[PDB]
């Protein structure tokens, strides 16, 4: 009667925050790109044709983009993908031979400071006897002299081993949906204004996240999801000048990057089996890679960010933009991949401004490096094989990674500079609206129900 | 008022609804609980824990006086120390998420009074009652 009795319910909407092993999903057309397994999609699960989003009415859940484990899982996934993708590839161990290089064939000036070097060296053929006098063409960032001609060496021969990327695979970022196993679920924040931390008013659940392309880049966030209405400013600690400031754009910034060098692929044979893809002579003029950003689009984008920065640093304050402080080449430049090559662009023409409380294109100098050691990894050095023909790419600038100086003088003006380094921040710009929860369908509740006595 | 019948909210649909209203959606969260070289082994270990989590709940659901899923009753008096709330104050004024946050402290205690005091003493009573 009035004295209650417990009753077991199975299938109750009860979840608690937890961490699990997420699997992948990447459409069915992404598997049709073939080309001997591009990137990752080999045994990845085809995406559900009609994904479902159940809008959880009256539900308010707290998210935390800076302590979200989906990021820490994705970062370790792409890294293992990189090592697994270089395991059956050609290893360039006998390429650390002495290189007798000279300037590339051009006509002065003395300010061209070479950059491109025409290197000649010995090489092992298929047989283990007679040698091989072959030549290649390396970038200045890939070689380093050592003390008759001027003598160089590969910049990684004194750091770690080196492996050549197979020409069969491609570095094209393809959409990857992250899904949760049975009994688990992924919550999605649907508010138009959300800084990644705190309770979310309009929460919906999904089984698989939207298509997130693993674009590895620094300083400039490329091809990401645009924010809603006004641009968003997200940071783990605004008061701390040591924590990075992730910015998300509303309107995409058209960026145009080219490689004005018709390269030729020389396929020298270091047999038996293995084959190295050298750089032959260049067809045409010796020009350097560059990226263009329309001054009109960039002026409006920067003015929309500084107006949002004043909501945190005082209404009437002066915000000045300056380029990077220094360090590695991957931190001071806009590192990205386009057509297989690895560009490194000078962003000193983008962060040169000073905004108070109230028709052409911007060309940026881009250098190219072939031998890389991404993700702060030592031991595994990758030689990006040369790409034939002029490479052209058009991307969307959808966000920034800024750092603030400590020089203060705090209540007056504030200076912001481009940062990066940790690529884990790059995943946080897309996983800010997702989190993993555990379903506990077992919930007990009292009611005026008693069982039998097998009467 | 006029009505055109029942509607559907989906998986975890009635998460923000009252416990009494969310008790109608039990057969929805029960449906999607099982759902039918490396990187391919990552999903295998996930699909193994999914069924371990299912049989874990099914074993608990079996050793209690239920086995038959969805809903089931028990002969255990609700101790007043476990947040003394009313019948009309729980099913018509509380969500399952808000409720599990309060009873989380006594969930493990209640589980013990269900497996031991009941089907071990109830079924043994049936062995004495079924022989005559």
């Amino acid at each position, epitope marked *: 009667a009035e004295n209650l009795w417990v009753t077991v319910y199975y299938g109750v909407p009860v979840w608690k925050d937890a961490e699990t092993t997420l699997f992948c999903a990447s459409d069915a057309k992404a598997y049709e790109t073939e080309k001997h397994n591009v990137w990752a999609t080999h045994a990845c699960v085809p995406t559900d044709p*009609n994904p479902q989003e*159940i*809008h959880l*009415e009256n539900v308010t859940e707290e998210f935390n983009m800076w302590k979200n484990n989906m990021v820490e899982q994705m970062h370790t996934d792409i890294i293992s993908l990189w090592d697994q993708s270089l395991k059956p590839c050609v290893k360039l161990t006998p390429l650390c031979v002495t290189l007798q290089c000279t300037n590339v064939t051009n006509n002065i000036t003395d300010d061209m400071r070479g950059e491109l070097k025409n290197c000649s060296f010995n090489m092992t053929t298929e047989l283990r006897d007679k040698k091989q006098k072959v030549y290649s063409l390396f970038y200045r960032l890939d070689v380093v002299q050592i003390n008759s001609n001027k003598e160089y060496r590969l910049i990684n021969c004194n750091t770690s081993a080196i492996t050549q990327a197979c020409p069969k695979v491609s570095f094209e970022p393809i959409p990857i949906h992250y899904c949760a196993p049975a009994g688990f679920a992924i919550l999605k924040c*649907k*508010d*138009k204004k959300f800084n990644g931390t705190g309770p979310c008013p*309009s929460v*919906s659940t999904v089984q698989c996240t939207h298509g997130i392309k693993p674009v590895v880049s620094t300083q400039l966030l490329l091809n990401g999801s645009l924010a809603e209405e006004e641009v968003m400013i997200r940071s783990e600690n605004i008061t701390n000048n040591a924590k990075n400031i992730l910015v998300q754009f509303n309107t995409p910034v058209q960026i145009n990057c080219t490689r004005p060098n018709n390269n030729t692929r020389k396929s020298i044979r270091i047999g038996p089996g293995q084959a190295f893809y050298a750089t032959g002579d260049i067809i045409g003029d010796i020009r350097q890679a560059h990226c263009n950003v329309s001054k009109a689009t960039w002026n409006e984008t920067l003015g929309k960010v500084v107006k949002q920065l004043r909501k945190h640093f005082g209404n009437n304050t002066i915000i000045r933009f300056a380029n990077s402080s220094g360090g590695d080449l991957e931190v001071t430049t806009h590192s990205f991949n386009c057509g297989g090559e690895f560009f490194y662009c000078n962003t000193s023409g983008l962060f040169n401004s000073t905004w108070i409380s109230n028709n052409d294109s911007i060309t940026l100098p881009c250098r190219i490096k072939q031998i890389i050691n991404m993700w702060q990894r030592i031991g595994q050095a990758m030689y990006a094989p040369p790409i034939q023909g002029v490479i052209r790419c058009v991307s969307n600038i959808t966000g920034l990674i800024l750092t603030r100086d400590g020089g203060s003088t705090n209540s007056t003006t504030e200076t912001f500079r481009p940062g990066g380094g940790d690529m884990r921040d790059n995943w946080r710009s897309e996983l800010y609206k997702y989190k993993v929860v555990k379903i506990e369908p077992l919930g007990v509740a009292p009611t005026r129900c008693k069982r039998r006595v097998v009467g | *008022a*006029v*009505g*055109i*019948g*029942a*509607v*559907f*909210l*989906g998986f975890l*649909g009635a998460a923000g609804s009252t416990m009494g209203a969310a008790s109608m959606t039990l057969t929805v969260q029960a449906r999607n609980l099982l759902s039918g070289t490396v990187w391919g082994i990552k999903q295998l270990q996930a699909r193994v824990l999914a069924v371990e989590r299912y049989l874990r709940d099914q074993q608990l659901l079996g050793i209690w006086g239920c086995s038959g899923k969805l809903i089931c009753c028990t002969n255990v008096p609700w101790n007043s120390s476990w947040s003394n709330r009313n019948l009309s104050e729980i099913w018509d004024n509380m969500t399952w998420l808000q409720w599990d946050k309060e009873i989380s402290n006594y969930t493990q205690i209640i589980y013990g009074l269900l497996e031991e005091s009941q089907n071990q003493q109830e079924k043994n009573e049936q062995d004495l009652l079924a022989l005559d």
Partner: antibody, heavy 122, light 108 residues
């Protein structure tokens, strides 16, 4: 986030039929009954009927019974209104509107589509 | 059908006035009655349901009363965005019907 998006304006001749669509975003399409309401230019609001998107069951205002037809496609979160045997009296703006549907009954229309203009003329 | 009659059809008021508009039903509809706001060129917005309950996000200056055949909607102090047409609607039986509308205009 919770919005209804309707198809664009349409013109039809008398006697023909028009099919207008309404797609639900930001909520579970099958969780709320859906009304269709029209407004002749300069006039008030007239209820045509409503549909349960879960079951597909419909009830039509008897003035329009056998002339106006309500259907749904759950996969695309979209409801359809077929208005047949048109005359000039059917000219106006057509709205879809979600009902709060508390207690599985009509309570109030809390989210409206932007409306679809339909003109019937020769 | 049930007829809902709103009065007045056209109400003139100044910014700051307290005003009350009336909706009468030809038969008893209990509390099963909603109020809407409509502006030229826009879809209606829900203000009131269950005859007296404020819809989420509607400003507190809106209130409503009544049961049976007599209903009112009151604005405690009119603001410029409140001058618009207002409709009442019953859901007590088929077919659903709307009132003829009350247009609130600014005095000058």
């Amino acid at each position: 986030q919770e919005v209804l998006v309707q198809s664009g304006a349409e013109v039809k001749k008398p006697g023909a039929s028009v099919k207008v669509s309404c797609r639900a975003f930001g909520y579970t399409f099958t969780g709320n009954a859906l009304h269709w309401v029209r407004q002749a230019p300069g006039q008030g609001l007239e209820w045509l009927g409503w549909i349960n998107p879960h079951s597909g069951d419909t009830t039509t205002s008897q003035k329009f019974q056998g002339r106006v037809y309500m259907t749904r496609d759950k996969s695309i979160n979209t409801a359809f209104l077929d208005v047949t045997r048109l005359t000039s009296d059917d000219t106006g703006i057509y709205y879809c509107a979600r009902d709060k549907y508390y207690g599985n009954e009509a309570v109030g229309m809390d989210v409206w589509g932007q409306g679809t203009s339909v003109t019937v003329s020769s | 059908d049930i007829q809902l009659t709103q009065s007045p059809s056209f109400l003139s008021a100044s910014v700051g006035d307290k005003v009350t508009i009336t909706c009468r039903a030809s038969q008893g509809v209990r509390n099963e009655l909603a109020w809407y706001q409509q502006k030229p060129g826009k879809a209606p917005n829900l203000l009131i349901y269950y005859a007296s309950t404020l819809q989420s996000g509607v400003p507190s200056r809106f209130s409503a009363t009544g049961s049976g055949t007599h209903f009112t909607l009151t604005v405690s102090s009119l603001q410029p965005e409140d001058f618009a047409t207002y409709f009442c609607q019953h859901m007590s039986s088929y077919p659903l019907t709307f009132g003829g509308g009350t247009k609130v205009e600014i005095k000058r």
